[PDB]
Structure formats: structure tokens, C-alpha cells
Write a protein that binds this DNA or RNA. Structure first.
Ligand SMILES: Nc1ncnc2c1ncn2[C@@H]1O[C@H](COP(=O)(O)OP(=O)(O)O)[C@@H](O)[C@H]1O
Lengths: 1170, 132
DNA sequence: AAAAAAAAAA
DNA sequence: ATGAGTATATCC
DNA sequence: TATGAGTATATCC
């Protein structure tokens, strides 16, 4: 693939200047993805001087500094910029210190800093600090302090360099800084002079300064190369002490971000997010009280006019103040919450978009003790304040208020940046938010936690009526929250409710990044359908639309035809052999049982050694299988006069523990070498490429492969998936044996100067089990592992891979420390397993010369776990295709369980939405309009086409699918049948038979058989029959549909028969209580049901009398009530209570559409109507 | 000790040293707990970090170490005077320590000498009065 | 004049 | 109170 | 315009 393709990609992305699209590219490894993107970036940077790009990858072993240097050298033609003032490598603090120390030890500091004594003393101090930091690397608690000490030492070194450069440029540092100490706040002019001086400095000095400190002039750098972990975090500017985050820096505006390990980045981002969420916690009550107090100060005009005049003119401000006052009065938040513990552990409370959760079973309750003037919180049955309702309501208020404040802070920052003349010290959005929060009187920690509820994400502008970003995934939109109650003797009078909010999933971070920069994602697995080890591409496409571009549209079809390998492999007679290891207990099963028996004793003490090693582990019967599979793999390696290079990848690195013991593996390999293979094994060796060794992985791999290219040996390279499983080069220069033995598959039309024509790929790979797809940590506490577990389950739920039943079972298991089995038909698990396997198998496809026979050795579990569901095997390596043909005996069907789980999840989400909307509509006015609009949308067309649903006043106005989760009809059917499991929880089974959703319960039957009712339907634009179409209502939606249909028909027939005109209520706080009223005399409620079952009379009467009693207290009148049913099958009997205030009529018309109300009944109707 | 030159980073080094010493103390606490049959589990499960105890459990530990042989109890009392401070009749220390706090055994948060009840009605002998 | 979404109960 | 078996990266 | 002129000790954050 040519560099012109990537140049076209880059120029297309740059043409999206005000929209910032996302482009993804799938290309199999060994195709040029990384060779040509580097050349294209260098060429574009050279041609366009205002182009800025970031190159981001997860592992610093994949940063490709040398490749960038080579490409820059071969791309610049006339000016030949030194590549250090244009291309920068932003390293971590530890790596910068390591480079500084190494330069000091190798006399590479350019004799200007070397001569000074201040610089030398600072370097000696830095070396001591680095030694201490290395010593304290074990415990993560000491990691923070060691890092702080190292940062201080590095800052002192930077200050020394600053003074040395300032005196050489005649800059009055001290005057610019402060005659005293801590200062060095230089003006733009002084640092400009310093930059000019280093620009005119000799080339070696400037080159060293620019390489060691790329942040010396970060604006001049056109390409910035850094890890994902560094990209998420902050960079420390030269000349300054405080670090600036890449997230809000102006360096990202209109830039191009090339994520070379998209999708491997997501996990990294996710992990970082989790850590950050746990670092920031605050007392919820005090936080809410302080924010309310600050907002009230804003109201009374006690803040400077600059922000005060922007807060007060918006109606949302008045609404926020009203909600704050109502919440303070409702939950008694003015008073102290005291939770009395006798010593028992309190656990914590979780809130996930599906439910609340208590880690110690009994729910927490809270009431207001008036004698104590406190809010008593505990496990008592008395709950007068609805604590389990208090916790999420305050969180929702905080999230909304912080979004409002973020908008105001954006306005303030924009206005303030106009005043500034030199736009080199502009304030970021984070600075504006912190200034606003400080002006409101909040603490620094409170400002941090309030700002992290949403990080500068405020969307675009009504998308300029282009594309409607919609999504039904609740976890991406609400996140989750954690709450822990703490009692301390130094705040003995109240209990602190420490809160911990997680809102920024990696998908949201990527969208926020796309709000200000173009992103190009590159990998061979960039679009594998999985939400565990890849972004939720469904969510990304839902929220992006046209802005999610595809890279393959910018390649010539010759390249795509070149991606194929099943033809070139056959033409050269390359044969791939998959060998699965059926090994359980003892070593005779792996030794070659062909009749060259050596001894029936030596293998017995080999088994004894294995058993002794396993037994000394601080579960067993499983580590033996792992050891035996590995030993079988390199037995196969040791018994072949071929396979000069073999790679064995596991999910664990060899170390000191008995579960994978390094020197035991080494001695086992040596014993097997001298035990099997006379002349085959003498030319062999074993290398363990690991991060535990005292040298970088690059030289380990280089020497291991030089043992084959030059040493004439056969190496077995053993390592982990996480070390060299992704994007690592493992080919080597051929030797005479490989030259006379291998075959070449280079396409016709390739040069001889290509390196792929002089190297040979691996001849064999052992694929160990990929182990940590889903968490398995058992003690569930409020830490990183527990959050990762919960978030993985939430991701699975969002992608319609587990239903509410499985999530509830998993949560119940977590309450008991009895974690459940992994879901059997969750596509994402198998796709992630396959992704790791695909990345591993791509490490032997980086060359054109291949051995005629390739052997892939793996245990049976790898065969059972891999799959091809959403993976385009056509454009995958031949090795993986052969592996799939070997693993075909265990292929699963994911489409069906995914379909039923999608139906169940959509129904559950609709039911949760309606459960919320009723309780909120209790005290709202507009959401009544939304609820009305959704119900009428239901009844206007039960079956709706996809585009018709997407373009509607109810779908285009809400930004999600509130209530509008229609099912999918693959057969365009007009009916279906569902068995309800728990209608109280909205759980349904779409394979069972307990209820029918169709037009039979609609107006088609027993409803259109009334005079004028069908006319009323045709007048109200309600279809009589469900026309076969794309999407159909779910049972939760069908409930409201039949309810509204029955409401309309029954009210119409009631008006026709009894000739009375009913009136509706007009007070906001009493909604969803009674359908209509009558002359200030009666309240009327309508029902649509099946034949009358043995319903719980007492609960229904209790609820209806409760709403009646609250209406009695509010209306200051004595009221009657009517319960009316529309359809029945037996004699109707309006039964009243002994007092006579409640009427219950069962059925109005029969199944033939004619009423069953006789003159007697009728009169009684009139008597009760009065 | 490697980082005793600068004072700005002395705080961080002191914090790490305090954490390590607290880990040692927690190890000793759980050893004596399993040797005294005391429900270390209450703590050890409900306190996998904070590690708080109640008066009766520490009293049982103290009365167990009371009847323990002379040599080992002697070492424990010599190295950890705060193991039972309400039994020490004489407390020898530097004024720099007297102004500051002492970290009690069975606990992580240090308690200042100034507000502690151990000074009530005590006799404080300042060996160099003017130099203090 | 671009704040969110809040059942119980397990 | 069982299911299942980690390494990589970097600021406070 | 105007003076006085060190080494050393100890503990928590
Ligand atoms: N003209 C070329 N096009 C593509 N790759 C080339 C070319 N010349 C040499 N190579 C080598 O081919 C190898 C292919 O790997 P590379 O393309 O970097 O990774 P990927 O194929 O995963 O994108 C590289 O190691 C690169 O050095």
C-alpha cells in the first residue's frame, strides 16, 4: 500500500475542520500500516507548516522513534530540518530522568551544562532521587511520594538549566522571577530570547536540549510522539512548575491524533479513568450544601458582575435554584446525618443505571429525629426521608448544575481571552471552571469533584440540523456512583457520605476528543465487534453518524486483493498444521510415543519434579496442565529439523512463583533437549523475553533472533501476550538453511530492496490460553478491581449480551463473594479472545519468506474459545483461518441469544424510563408533554419503519430513545407472544407464551365494533390494524399503547352513553393520580385489562384510597371514585363499598362491541354521578 | 537515609517510613491475635486497611503478654513502650518528641502528648530548663 | 436562554 | 458463600 | 545613611 493512500486519508481528515471526523482502518499486519503512516505524516508535516499531529500507542516499545527519524530524513529534501525542532518524543518523568542520568554517565551533556557546578550538583541530587524512586517501586502508596520527590529533583535540574540559559541570553532571571526563591515566572519576551539563543546555538547543543526536553518549545513541534498513558495525563512545560493537561491544552485544537493501537487504547483509557474516579471523593451532603450556598450567593448579586450577569438571565438558573431549595427542604440536608455504628462494617452502596445495590443486604434508612435535631441514618425500619431516593437525586442535581456551570465557565473563558493581548497565556476551560467554583466558595477538592462530573463536554450546536446523535445505552449516559459512610472521632457529630462518580467511559473520552481534533485509528483489529477490548463501535456510530469514516475507501483495489493470502499460500505449497494438546496429568502424554523408548524411569522423576513444584504453591491440578502444554510445545519444537524460530506466548510471564517458575522451565527444556532429539535438538536454545530482565525487550529479541540469523541455532522465544503480542517484529535475516528451505510469497510488482524480501518469518507458534478477558477478583470492595468488574458487566449489558436476570444474579453473587460463571453466549468475550489470538498470530506475518510447513500448537481451550462472528476472516491471516477450520467443532451461534437479549434489554429500559417518568411527572410540567407525545406516537403507528422512527418530533428532541425502544421484526410480522417473568421489574421472555402483543388487544377486535369508535380512530389518525413494517412495540410499550387506546375508546363510549362531559385536573403536584374529574365531585380512572383475575383486592384498594386521601387533603372536598373496565366476558356488576364512595365496574362492552349497561345500571350510574 | 539531605522531600520519606513501620506493627498485632485466640477476623475483615480493635480484645492481648515469658515480653516492652502506656510510671524522652505526638500501638493515627490524658497530674522534669 | 432525569426490593 | 488463573504505563 | 561576622540537635507531617 502506497504512501499516497495515507496522504489522501490525512488531507480528507483535515478537510473536516469544523466537524473533526473519526477514521478507522482495518489492514492485516505486515501490510505497511505503520511503515507508510509514518512517511505520510512526515511528508504532510513538511509540506504544511501549520499541521500538528500526535502519534499515540499504548506501549513505548511501539513508539517507533527510529522509524520516524528515518522517514523524516528521507522525506525532507531541501531544508533538512534537524527533526528535533519538528518531531518530539514526550516521555514520562521517569524516562526523562533515566535519559538524563544516562547522558550524564556517557558524557553526552554538551559541555555547557557540564561545566557549571550548579548543574552538576543538581544532576547528582537527581541521581540520588532516581535511585530512591527505583527502590520504592514496589508499593503503590510509596509510588506517589517517590514520584513527587523525583519530580522535585527534575524541576531543580530544569531551574539550573534555565539560569544557565538566561545568563547567556542576558536575561534578568531573578528580576523576571523574584529576587527570592520559588518563582521563575518569566515573561513571554525573556523565554522568546532564550529560544532565539538556543536556535542560533551550535547544532549539537540544540539537538540535545530539544531531544531531552521536547516541551522546551512545544508549539514548534509538528509531530508529537507519546504513549496513551502520557496522552491522557499532563505534560510539564519548560520554564514552569505546574503541569498542563493534554486534555484542555490548546495544542490539540484542529490537530490530527493517530492512535496506532486503536482498539488497544480503550482498556488503557478505561483503567486510567477508573483510577481517577477513585482518587476524587467528597462528602455528598456538604458538597451539595456548599454548591447551593454558592449559587444563592450568585442570585443575590454578591459575585463580580462578569459572571453574575451571565448566570442570572437564564431561566435554567432559576430552575436550578428552585430545585436546590426543594431538595434541601425535602431531604433535611441542612441538618447533620449521624449514622451510629457499634463496630460492624458498613460496606458501601452502588448505583448503576439498572438498580441500587447494598453490599451488606439490609437497605439504609433515614429519618429526622426532631428531639436530637439530626437525621438518623441506619438499618432501622423507619425511613421517613427515602434515603435510597436521596442518594441518586442529589447526584442528578449535581451533574446538571455542574453542566450549567461548565457552560457559564466556557462563556467566561471566551470573554476573558478577548482581553488578553498576547494569546500565549490564555486560560483553559479547566482554569475557568476552577475559578468559577472558587468564586462560589467551594474548596479545591470540591471543585475537582464537581468538575469531574463531566469534563468540558457540552456538545455541538443543534448539529446545525445535520445529524441527530441518539443512543439507547444507559451506562454511557449515566455512568455509575459509589457511596461509603465513614465515622471519625474528629467529626464525631456527623457521618460522612463519601461519593465516587464514574461517568467518563473511554467512548465518551473519544467523543470529547473528537469535539476538538481529528482521530485516525489503525490496527488489524480496529473494528472487531467487542465492548471489552475495543470501543463500543455501535455507540460510536450512533453518536457520530457520518463523522465515523472508513479508511478502506482510500485504497486501491490492488491492495485489498493483496490482503488475501489463501491463494498465495497455495501457490507456494505452504501448509499450516494445527496441533491441539489433549494433555491432563502426566508427561508420557506429551513425549513422542513412537517406539524410540528411552527409559520408563527418567520421565517418572520428571513427573515427580513437576508434582513437587506444583505442590509447593502457596489449587493445583490446573498448573500441571499449563506446564505440560508448554513442555509439549517445545517438545514439538525440539523434534523437527525445521522451525528455526519458534515463539511461545502465554498470558503469564515466567518469574519466581511456582505457578510459572522460570528456572524450572529452563531446566525442563534442557533435560528434554538432552532426552529427546539426537541431532535435531543440539542446534537449539531457549530465550525468555521478559520485562523482568535487566535490558530492554528490543535487545533481548535482537540477540535471540541473531542466534538464528548468525549463530546458526534454533531459538525458542517464550514471552507473554502483553509483552510482545502486539505490533512486535519477530522476523530475522535468513541463513543458508532458510534460504535453501523457505518459500517466497512476495506479490508480483515488489522491489528487491524491501526488507521483507531478505527476512523470514517465524516457523511456529505456541498459543497459550488468554486468561484475563473478564475480571475474577473475588473480594468486592470499592477499589479498581471492583469498578473494573462492574463496568465490564455494564458494558456487556449495554451491548445486549447479558439480560437483567444475569446482571441481578451476578450482583447477588457479589453480595456473597460467590461470583457466577462467565456468560456462555456473550459475543464480546469470544471476540476478545479471538482478538488476542489474531494479534499473536500476526507476529509471524512480517516477511515474504516463509518455511514450507508451519506448525501452530495450542491447548484445546484456545480452540474452544476462538470464533468468527463479525470478524472478516477473508482479510485475516491464513494461520488464523486454518486455526478456525481446526476449531470448527465448537462454533457457537451468537445471533439468536443476542436478538432475544436485545429485546429483553429494550423492554427493561423502556420500563425503567417509565418508572422514572411517572415519579418525576408527579412534580413537573413539560415532561407531561413528553409523556403525552410518546404515548400518542405509540398509538399513531404501532409498527413504524426505521427512517420514520428516526425522523420524528419525539425522537429528534430527546437525544436518547426515552420510551422509544422499539423491537425488531426480522420477518416484518404483525404479532408476537411473550411470557412475563416479573412485570413488577419489567422482565419478559420472548420465547415463552404468557401474553400476546398484537392488534387483538387493540381496536381491531371488540373495539371497532362500536358505532362511531372506528370513526373516532380514523379521525384521530390511529390505524385500526398493525401494518407489517420494520419495528414493533415492546411489551412495556404495548402496555401504554393498549392503555391509551382503551382510555380513548372508553371515554368516548362513556360520553356517548351517559351523555356527560368530563373535565381534566389542573394542579401540577397531583398528576398520575386520577385520569379525570367530574364537576368537583368525582374523580374518574380508566382501565384496560383482560378478563378479571383473582387480583389482590386489598392492595389495589389501599393504593387507590391513598391517592384519594392525598387528593382529599389537597382539594378540601370529599370525593368519590370510579374504576371502569372496557372489555369483559361475563355479567357486569358495579360493586360499591359499604360507605359507597368507591365504584368498581368490570367491563363496559362485550367482545361484540355492544354495551352491557341496563336501565337499572344506568340509573345507579346517575345516582353515583350525584 | 538516602534522602536525608533536603527537607522538602523529608516529609515524603518520613511518610513512607511511617507506613512501613505501621505494616510491621500490624504484622505483630495479627501474630499476637492468633496467639491469643482473639477475633482478629472482626478487624481483619472489617478493617482490612484501618484495622481498629475494641478495648476487650486489646485487654486480652495485654493480659496474654503479661503472663508471657520474661525475654520476649521484655523485648516487646522495650521496643514498643506505647504497647501499654497507662502502666509506664516514668517516660524518658527528648523535648522535641515531647512537643510532638506519639503513635500508639494498635493504632495508626498519632496522638499528641499535649492533649493526651497521660499528662494529667503528672510530674514533668525538664533536665535543661533554660535550653528547652 | 442549551441542566439532568429521580420506583421498591433484592 | 466458587470461578477462574496479568502485564503495561504514568501523574498527583 | 546606617551592622555584625555559627554549629548544631531532633521529630512529625
Ligand atoms: N515499501 C514498503 N512498504 C511497506 N513496508 C515496508 C516497505 N519497505 C520495508 N517495509 C517493512 O515492512 C514491514 C511491515 O511492517 P509494518 O508495515 O511496519 O507494520 P504493519 O504491516 O503492521 O503496518 C516493516 O517492518 C517495514 O520496515
Amino acid at each position: 500500500m502506497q504512501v499516497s493512500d495515507f496522504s489522501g486519508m490525512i488531507k480528507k481528515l483535515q478537510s473536516q475542520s469544523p466537524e473533526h471526523a473519526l477514521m478507522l482502518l482495518n489492514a492485516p499486519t505486515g501490510t505497511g500500516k505503520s511503515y507508510t503512516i509514518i512517511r505520510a505524516l512526515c511528508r504532510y508535516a513538511i509540506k504544511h507548516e501549520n499541521f500538528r499531529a500526535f502519534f499515540v500507542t499504548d506501549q513505548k516499545k511501539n513508539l517507533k522513534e527510529q522509524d520516524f527519524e528515518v522517514a523524516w530524513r528521507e522525506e525532507s529534501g531541501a531544508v533538512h530540518k534537524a527533526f528535533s525542532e519538528r518531531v518530539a518524543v514526550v516521555r514520562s518523568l521517569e524516562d526523562t530522568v533515566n535519559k538524563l542520568i544516562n547522558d550524564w554517565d556517557r558524557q553526552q551533556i554538551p559541555d555547557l551544562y557540564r561545566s557549571s557546578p550548579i548543574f552538576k550538583k543538581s544532576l547528582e541530587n537527581l541521581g540520588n532521587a532516581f535511585k530512591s524512586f527505583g527502590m520504592m517501586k514496589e508499593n503503590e502508596f510509596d509510588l506517589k511520594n517517590a514520584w513527587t520527590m523525583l519530580s522535585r529533583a527534575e524541576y531543580q535540574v530544569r531551574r539550573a538549566m534555565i539560569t544557565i540559559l538566561a545568563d547567556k541570553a542576558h536575561v534578568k532571571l531573578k528580576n523576571i522571577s523574584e529576587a527570592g526563591a520559588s518563582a521563575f515566572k518569566l515573561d513571554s519576551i525573556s523565554k522568546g530570547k532564550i529560544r532565539e539563543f538556543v536556535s542560533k546555538q551550535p547544532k549539537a547543543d540544540s539537538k540535545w536540549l530539544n531531544e531531552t526536553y521536547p516541551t522546551f518549545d512545544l508549539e514548534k513541534k509538528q509531530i508529537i510522539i507519546l504513549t496513551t498513558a502520557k496522552f491522557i495525563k499532563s505534560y510539564t512545560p519548560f520554564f514552569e512548575k505546574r503541569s498542563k493537561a493534554f486534555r484542555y491544552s490548546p495544542i490539540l485544537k484542529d490537530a490530527l491524533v493517530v492512535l496506532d493501537e486503536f482498539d488497544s487504547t480503550k482498556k488503557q483509557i478505561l483503567e486510567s479513568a477508573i483510577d481517577e474516579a477513585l482518587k476524587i471523593q467528597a462528602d455528598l451532603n456538604s458538597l451539595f450544601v456548599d454548591l447551593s450556598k454558592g449559587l444563592n450567593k450568585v442570585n443575590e448579586g454578591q459575585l463580580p458582575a462578569k459572571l453574575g450577569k451571565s448566570f442570572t438571565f437564564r431561566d435554567a438558573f432559576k430552575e436550578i435554584l428552585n430545585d436546590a431549595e426543594q431538595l434541601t427542604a425535602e431531604f433535611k440536608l441542612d441538618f447533620l446525618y449521624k449514622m451510629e455504628e457499634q463496630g460492624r462494617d458498613s460496606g458501601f452502596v452502588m448505583r448503576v443505571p439498572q438498580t441500587n445495590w447494598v453490599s451488606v443486604g439490609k437497605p439504609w434508612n433515614a429519618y429526622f429525629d426532631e428531639e436530637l435535631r439530626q437525621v438518623v441514618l441506619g438499618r432501622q425500619p423507619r425511613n421517613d426521608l427515602n434515603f435510597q431516593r436521596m442518594l441518586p437525586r442529589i447526584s442528578v442535581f449535581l451533574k446538571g448544575a455542574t453542566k450549567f456551570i461548565l457552560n457559564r465557565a466556557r462563556e467566561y473563558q471566551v470573554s476573558e481571552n478577548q482581553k488578553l493581548s498576547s494569546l500565549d497565556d490564555a486560560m483553559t476551560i479547566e482554569d475557568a471552571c476552577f475559578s468559577i467554583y472558587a468564586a462560589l466558595g467551594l474548596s479545591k477538592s470540591q471543585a475537582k469533584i464537581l468538575f469531574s462530573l463531566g469534563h468540558d463536554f457540552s456538545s455541538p450546536t443543534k448539529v446545525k440540523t445535520t445529524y441527530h446523535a441518539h443512543s439507547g445505552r444507559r451506562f454511557q449516559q449515566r455512568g455509575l456512583s459509589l457511596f461509603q459512610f465513614t465515622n471519625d472521632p474528629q467529626h464525631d457529630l456527623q457521618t460522612k457520605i463519601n461519593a465516587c462518580f464514574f461517568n467518563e467511559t473511554p467512548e465518551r473520552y473519544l467523543l470529547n476528543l473528537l469535539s476538538k481534533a481529528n482521530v485516525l485509528g489503525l490496527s488489524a483489529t480496529a473494528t472487531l465487534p467487542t465492548v471489552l477490548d475495543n470501543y463500543d463501535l455501535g455507540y460510536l456510530r450512533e453518536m457520530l453518524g457520518p463523522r465515523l469514516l472508513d479508511g478502506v475507501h482510500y485504497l486501491s483495489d490492488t491492495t485489498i486483493k493483496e490482503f488475501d493470502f489463501e491463494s498465495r499460500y497455495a501457490k507456494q505449497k505452504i501448509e499450516v498444521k494445527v496441533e491441539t494438546g489433549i494433555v491432563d496429568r502426566f508427561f508420557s502424554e506429551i513425549l513422542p510415543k513412537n517406539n524410540q523408548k528411552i527409559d520408563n524411569k527418567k520421565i517418572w522423576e520428571l513427573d515427580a519434579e513437576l508434582a513437587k513444584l506444583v505442590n509447593c504453591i502457596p489449587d493445583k491440578k490446573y498448573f500441571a496442565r499449563r506446564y505440560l502444554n508448554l513442555f509439549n510445545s517445545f517438545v514439538i519444537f525440539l523434534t523437527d529439523p525445521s522451525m528455526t524460530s519458534f515463539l511461545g506466548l502465554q498470558s503469564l510471564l515466567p518469574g519466581a512463583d511456582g505457578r510459572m517458575d522460570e528456572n524450572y522451565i529452563k531446566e525442563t527444556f534442557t533435560t528434554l533437549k538432552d532426552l529427546v532429539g539426537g541431532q535435531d535438538g543440539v542446534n537449539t536454545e531457549l530465550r525468555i523475553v521478559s520485562s523482568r530482565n535487566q535490558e530492554g525487550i528490543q535487545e533481548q529479541l535482537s540477540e535471540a533472533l541473531n542466534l538464528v540469523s548468525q549463530g546458526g541455532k534454533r531459538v525458542y522465544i517464550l514471552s507473554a501476550y502483553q509483552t510482545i503480542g502486539i505490533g512486535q517484529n519477530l522476523q530475522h535475516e535468513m541463513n543458508e538453511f532458510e534460504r535453501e528451505q523457505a518459500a517466497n510469497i512476495a506479490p508480483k510488482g515488489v522491489s528487491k530492496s524491501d526488507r521483507r524480501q531478505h527476512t523470514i518469518d517465524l516457523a511456529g507458534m505456541y498459543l497459550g490460553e488468554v486468561t484475563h478477558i473478564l475480571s475474577s477478583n473475588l473480594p468486592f470492595r470499592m477499589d479498581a478491581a471492583g469498578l473494573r468488574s462492574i463496568i465490564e458487566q455494564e458494558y456487556l449489558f449495554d451491548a445486549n449480551e447479558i439480560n437483567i436476570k444475569y446482571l441481578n444474579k451476578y450482583l447477588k453473587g457479589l453480595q456473597h463473594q460467590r461470583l457466577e460463571r462467565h456468560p456462555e453466549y456473550a459475543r464480546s468475550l469470544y471476540v476478545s479472545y479471538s482478538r488476542t489470538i489474531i494479534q499473536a498470530l500476526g507476529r509471524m506475518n512480517r516477511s515474504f519468506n516463509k518455511m514450507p510447513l508451519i506448525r501452530l500448537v495450542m491447548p484445546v481451550n484456545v480452540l474452544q474459545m476462538v470464533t468468527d462472528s463479525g470478524i472478516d476472516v477473508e482479510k485475516t491471516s491464513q494461520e488464523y483461518r486454518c486455526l478456525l477450520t481446526a476449531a470448527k467443532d465448537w462454533e457457537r451461534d451468537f445471533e439468536k441469544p443476542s436478538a432475544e437479549i436485545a429485546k429483553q434489554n429494550a423492554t427493561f429500559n423502556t420500563f425503567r424510563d417509565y418508572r422514572f417518568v411517572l415519579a418525576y411527572l408527579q412534580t413537573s410540567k413539560s415532561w407531561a408533554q413528553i409523556y403525552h407525545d410518546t404515548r400518542w406516537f405509540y398509538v399513531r403507528h404501532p409498527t413504524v419503519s426505521d427512517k420514520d422512527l428516526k425522523s420524528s418530533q419525539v425522537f429528534q428532541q430527546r437525544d436518547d430513545e426515552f420510551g422509544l425502544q422499539y423491537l425488531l421484526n426480522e420477518h416484518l410480522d404483525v404479532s408476537y407472544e411473550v411470557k412475563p417473568i416479573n412485570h413488577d421489574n419489567g422482565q419478559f421472555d420472548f420465547s415463552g407464551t404468557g401474553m400476546e402483543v398484537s392488534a387483538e388487544a387493540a381496536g381491531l377486535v371488540a373495539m371497532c365494533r362500536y358505532p362511531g369508535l372506528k370513526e373516532a380512530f380514523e379521525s384521530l389518525d390511529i390505524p385500526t390494524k398493525w401494518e407489517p413494517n420494520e419495528r414493533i412495540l415492546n411489551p412495556a410499550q404495548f402496555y401504554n399503547y393498549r392503555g391509551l387506546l382503551g382510555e380513548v375508546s372508553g371515554q368516548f363510549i362513556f360520553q356517548n352513553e351517559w351523555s356527560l362531559k368530563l373535565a381534566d385536573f389542573g394542579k401540577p403536584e397531583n398528576y398520575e393520580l386520577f385520569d379525570f374529574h367530574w364537576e368537583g365531585k368525582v374523580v374518574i380512572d380508566f382501565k384496560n385489562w383482560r378478563d378479571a383475575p383473582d387480583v389482590d383486592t386489598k392492595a389495589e384498594r389501599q393504593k387507590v384510597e391513598a391517592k384519594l386521601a392525598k387528593l382529599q387533603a389537597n382539594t378540601q372536598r370529599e370525593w368519590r371514585v370510579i374504576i371502569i373496565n372496557i372489555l369483559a366476558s361475563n355479567q357486569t356488576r358495579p360493586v360499591m363499598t359499604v360507605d359507597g364512595k368507591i365504584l368498581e365496574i368490570s367491563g363496559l362492552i362485550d367482545h361484540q362491541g355492544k354495551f352491557l349497561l341496563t336501565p337499572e345500571q344506568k340509573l345507579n350510574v346517575w345516582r353515583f354521578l350525584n
